[model samples]
Target: ATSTKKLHKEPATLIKAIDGDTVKLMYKGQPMTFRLLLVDTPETKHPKKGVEKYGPEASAFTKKMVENAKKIEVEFDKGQRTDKYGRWLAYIYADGKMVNEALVRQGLAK
Candidate 1:
């Protein structure tokens, strides 16, 4: 079971969009990589694997969202903090909209 408690929220500036589901940002004067929680987008840059279908479109959507963002906030989950790659596991809210859920609702991720 996962805790429902809110951990923290902080302002973040987009560094770059790694893909549809992953992005790099600057937070608190440090660079952080975040993997959007509960959503998985098509892979645009897999080292050993080739790019997957819909990968570019998903990446484009994410890039546009961040580039035009009025504000970006990273909200941590109540349970896990990082994945195996050490990227922060979080929910990103851009301009008051949840990016993770938006991607899913837009059929850009699952």
Candidate 2:
């Protein structure tokens, strides 16, 4: 006999990439939010903020990629769903594209 397993899919629309590390979404008809896992982009300015070496390009690239993306897939880790700021933390894919990995491989993200 063949075993069949059911899969659960959560649908969400990506509304914005707040920065290289953060995004905002609308999931299941409710306002939602997320932060990328295992990557940190340089902040524009802060007492401890040093430019990411390629900070501007990184931020710009992120903004360009995520604008107007609907129906993104999210994979949640144990620590996913919320960060210290109460934002969701998950691996994100938009239009079958992994933006975070793209950023790293392009040297725009770490």
Candidate closest to the true structure, highest TM-score? 1
lDDT of 1 by residue, 1-110 (tens): 95576677777765566764567767667767777655432453324321234454345555455668878777764455676433777666678776544554455453
Query: CA RMSD for every model?
Result: 6.1, 8.2
* lDDT (10s digit) by residue, model 2, range 63-109: 34555455466665443436454277655666666655555545554
Misplaced by over 4 Å in model 2 are 1-9, 40-70, 77-86
Q: State the C-alpha lDDT per candidate.
A: 0.59, 0.54
User: What TM-score does candidate 2 reach?
Assistant: 0.55
Give the C-alpha miss distance for residue 55 in model 2, angstroms: 4.6
What is the Cα-based TM-score of model 1?
0.61
| TM-score on alpha carbons, each prediction | 0.61, 0.55
Q: What residue pairs clash in candidate 1, if any at all? A: none
